[PDB]
Amino acid sequence: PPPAIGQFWHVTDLHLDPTYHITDDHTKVCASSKGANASNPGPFGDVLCDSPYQLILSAFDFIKNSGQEASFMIWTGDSPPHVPVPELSTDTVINVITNMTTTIQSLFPNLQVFPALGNHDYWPQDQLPVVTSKVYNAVANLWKPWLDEEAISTLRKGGFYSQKVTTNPNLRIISLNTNLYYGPNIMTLNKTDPANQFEWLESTLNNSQQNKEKVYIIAHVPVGYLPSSQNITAMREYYNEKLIDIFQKYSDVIAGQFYGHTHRDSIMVLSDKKGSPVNSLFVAPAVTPVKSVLEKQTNNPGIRLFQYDPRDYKLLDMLQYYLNLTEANLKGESIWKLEYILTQTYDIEDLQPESLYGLAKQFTILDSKQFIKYYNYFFVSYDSSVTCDKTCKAFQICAIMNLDNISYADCLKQLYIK
Ligand SMILES: Nc1ccn([C@@H]2O[C@H](COP(=O)(O)O)[C@@H](O)[C@H]2O)c(=O)n1
Ligand SMILES: *[C@@H]1O[C@H](CO)[C@@H](O)[C@H](O)[C@H]1NC(C)=O
Ligand SMILES: *[C@@H]1O[C@H](CO)[C@@H](O)[C@H](O)[C@H]1NC(C)=O
Ligand SMILES: *[C@@H]1O[C@H](CO)[C@@H](O)[C@H](O)[C@H]1NC(C)=O
Ligand SMILES: [Zn+2]
Ligand SMILES: [Zn+2]
């Protein structure tokens, strides 16, 4: 039993659409909808539209009014909205990051925050470079009030840094720019090691290894396989394999990992080369509810809070908060509710890797009531009469339990493939 509980927030993929507004021509409500009629728009947004400022605002207002205390906050990026490149620019990107960064800093003057860059936090999107740049330097200025000179230094070099936490200074947050590894990123094609991030990672980890230090990885694009499709890593396979090895090697140091990018609530469990679970990974869903017209599903906006043991930074639990957008628009109020408490709904001990690996196995049971939950929660309770066939479920399961491609294919073939 632990004598006090550490808590920190994780917010991601804010995707602000400064255009949003209610008007009678639903093609004009928000530029992110790209000309489509916004399905049923309200003051807190629309499924076809990125986040109106007031949604983003209510999310942070709920945190401040939450009645939870927190040592820090993790912010995994993607702040500009989904509109085509010509419609945007480097300066707009920066104004948007600036607004977010300021808005947070105003409401949370005393709170430390550790950002990571996402793939839309650049113009043109996804083209995050190896060497310094206007955006990298822009954010370094904006995030000074939360970071070292040492941190800040590397931040401008290639979009990344690492940082002891003020209120727990043997906890080091490592913020990675995994956008360097994202498919669409033309800057990094054919590069052995973009911005020497692997070198610096291997280096930064090895260093924490010795100094009795625990590490939390923060980043935007997760490692592993995208769970709602077949044999597609989120990053470039090549890098995913490379990163997994690194995490394998130093898993004793890493006490948790945290990502966004997918806009969905997901867990993953890294196993050692031997096949034994050794690191827990957590992909938090987005604040924006945005989606394609052809897509049945999306997320409800979401916000989450983690719990740790201040001694070893072991992960005790996670509480997932959300907005029932439809309701929130019907009432025209920000009723940020609690969706679930992780150890409660799944009836497991903690967030250790063995704990979660065990839950994963329970999912594999024919008609697992457990997996059913996990799939409601996967789209942040968005439709709850939602269902899932054997194949989709297989693609989820394998993703949760297999991070590198050997073991992901074994899991796929095992049951069954073209
Ligand atoms: N509404 C949305 C928005 C993004 N996505 C997916 O999640 C990822 C989100 O990346 P961005 O947030 O950088 O667009 C994309 O790879 C996209 O395929 C989705 O499935 N539904
Ligand atoms: C941020 O953006 C929104 C709309 O674009 C505006 O109403 C809000 O006041 C701005 N706030 C800051 C701190 O820039
Ligand atoms: C949007 O809404 C109006 C009213 O339903 C409709 O007549 C019009 O065709 C729609 N336009 C598009 C692009 O969907
Ligand atoms: C999975 O994807 C990679 C493409 O990156 C491919 O080379 C590999 O052969 C594929 N595996 C299967 C089972 O098709
Ligand atoms: Zn995003
Ligand atoms: Zn993204």
185 is annotated as contributing to ligand binding: no
Which atom of ligand 4 is least distant from the CA of 233? 5
Where do the DSSP E strands lie in 251-388? 254-259, 266-271, 277-283, 302-309, 314-323, 336-341
Cβ of 334: how many Cβ atoms within 10 Å?
A: 18
The conformation of residue 332, written as its DSSP 8-state character, comes to I
Query: Which residues have any ligand 3 atom within 6 Å of their CB?
Result: 26-27, 37
For residue 154, give both structure tokens.
Answer: 């590397």
Q: Give the residue, by CA position, lying nearest to ligand 2 atom 4.
A: 18
Rounded distance from Cα 26 to ligand 5 centre (Å)? 23
Identify which of 12, 46, 261 to mutate to test ligand 1's pocket (most ligand atoms within 8 A of the CB): 261
Nearest C-alpha neighbor of 360 from the set 403, 330, 328, 404: 403
Rounded CA separation 49/39 (Å): 9
For residue 119, give both structure tokens.
Answer: 């793939």
Residue 125 lies inside a defined structural domain of this protein: yes
Rounded CA separation 334/61 (Å): 9
Residue 92 lies inside a defined structural domain of this protein: yes
Rounded distance from Cα 271 to ligand 5 centre (Å)? 27
> C-alpha angle with apex 323: 320 to 326, nearest 5 degrees?
145
Residue 1 lies inside a defined structural domain of this protein: no
Residue 55 lies inside a defined structural domain of this protein: yes
Resolution of this deposited model, Å: 3.0
| Axis-axis angle for helices 90-107, 134-143 (nearest 10) | 10
Q: Give the residue, by CA position, lying nearest to ligand 1 atom 8.
A: 262
10 is annotated as contributing to ligand binding: no
Q: Tell me which H or E stretch contains 114.
A: strand 112-115
Nearest C-alpha neighbor of 379 from the set 391, 362, 366, 392: 392
Q: Give the residue, by CA position, lying nearest to ligand 3 atom 2.
A: 37
Residue 268 lies inside a defined structural domain of this protein: yes
For residue 175, give both structure tokens.
Answer: 């913020």
Our CA dihedral for 244, 353, 301, 259, rounded to 10 degrees, sits at -20
Rounded CA separation 237/224 (Å): 9
Inter-residue contact 83 to 31 (CB < 8 Å): yes
Amino acid (one-letter) located at 281: L
82 is annotated as contributing to ligand binding: yes
Query: Which residues have any ligand 1 atom within 6 Å of their CB?
Result: 13, 78, 118-120, 261-263, 290-291, 298
SS3 152: helix
Cβ of 2: how many Cβ atoms within 10 Å?
A: 13
Residue 149's CATH number: 3.60.21.10
Inter-residue contact 35 to 98 (CB < 8 Å): no
SS3 37: coil
Q: Please list the alpha-helical segments (H only) found in 336-384.
A: 342-346, 353-364, 369-378
Q: What count of residues does the chain have?
A: 418
For 292, left (φ over 0), alpha (ψ -120 to 50), or beta? beta
Which atom of ligand 4 is least distant from the CA of 409? 13
**Residue appearing with tokens 């008609």:** 367
Inter-residue contact 148 to 166 (CB < 8 Å): no
* Residue 303 main-chain phi, psi, to 5 deg: -155, 140
Cβ of 79: how many Cβ atoms within 10 Å?
A: 26
* Residue 216 main-chain phi, psi, to 5 deg: -110, 120
Query: Which residues have any ligand 4 atom within 6 Å of their CB?
Result: 231, 237, 409
For 199, left (φ over 0), alpha (ψ -120 to 50), or beta? alpha
Count up the domains in the chain and report the number: 1
Rounded distance from Cα 44 to ligand 3 centre (Å)? 22
Rounded CA separation 117/131 (Å): 15
Q: Give the residue, by CA position, lying nearest to ligand 4 atom 13.
A: 409
Please list, in sequence order, all residues whose beta carbon lies within 8 angstroms of the beta carbon of residue 298, skipping any fewer than 6 positions away: 47, 263, 289, 290, 291, 379, 382
β-sheet bridge partners, residue 163? 173
Rounded distance from Cα 55 to ligand 3 centre (Å)? 25
Instruction: Give how far the C-alpha of residue 114 lies from the chain's centroid of Cα atoms, to the nearest Å.
Output: 13
For 190, left (φ over 0), alpha (ψ -120 to 50), or beta? left
Rounded CA separation 418/302 (Å): 36
21 is annotated as contributing to ligand binding: no
Identify which of 37, 39, 40, 293 to mutate to test ligand 3's pocket (most ligand atoms within 8 A of the CB): 37
Where do the DSSP E strands lie in 141-265? 161-165, 168-176, 214-219, 254-259
Decide whether any atom of ligand 2 lies within 6 Å of the 99 Cβ. Answer: yes
Q: Is the dihedral of CA 291, 294, 295, 296 positive or negative?
A: positive
119 is annotated as contributing to ligand binding: yes
Residue 119 lies inside a defined structural domain of this protein: yes
Rounded CA separation 205/269 (Å): 19
When computed from its CA atoms, the radius of gyration of the chain, rounded to whole angstroms, is 20
Amino acid (one-letter) located at 413: K
For residue 4, give both structure tokens.
Answer: 């006090």
Experimental technique for the deposited model:
X-ray
Residue 126 lies inside a defined structural domain of this protein: yes
Inter-residue contact 140 to 156 (CB < 8 Å): yes
Nearest ligand to the CA of 99 is 2
Pairing of strands 277-283, 254-259: parallel
Where do the DSSP E strands lie in 154-220? 161-165, 168-176, 214-219
Inter-residue contact 181 to 224 (CB < 8 Å): no
Look up the domain containing 348 and give its range. Answer: 6-414
Q: Tell me which H or E stretch contains 72.
A: strand 72-75
The conformation of residue 182, written as its DSSP 8-state character, comes to B
Inter-residue contact 208 to 172 (CB < 8 Å): yes
For residue 249, give both structure tokens.
Answer: 């090697």
SS3 242: helix
Q: Tell me which H or E stretch contains 8.
A: strand 6-11
Rounded distance from Cα 55 to ligand 5 centre (Å)? 15
The conformation of residue 45, written as its DSSP 8-state character, comes to B
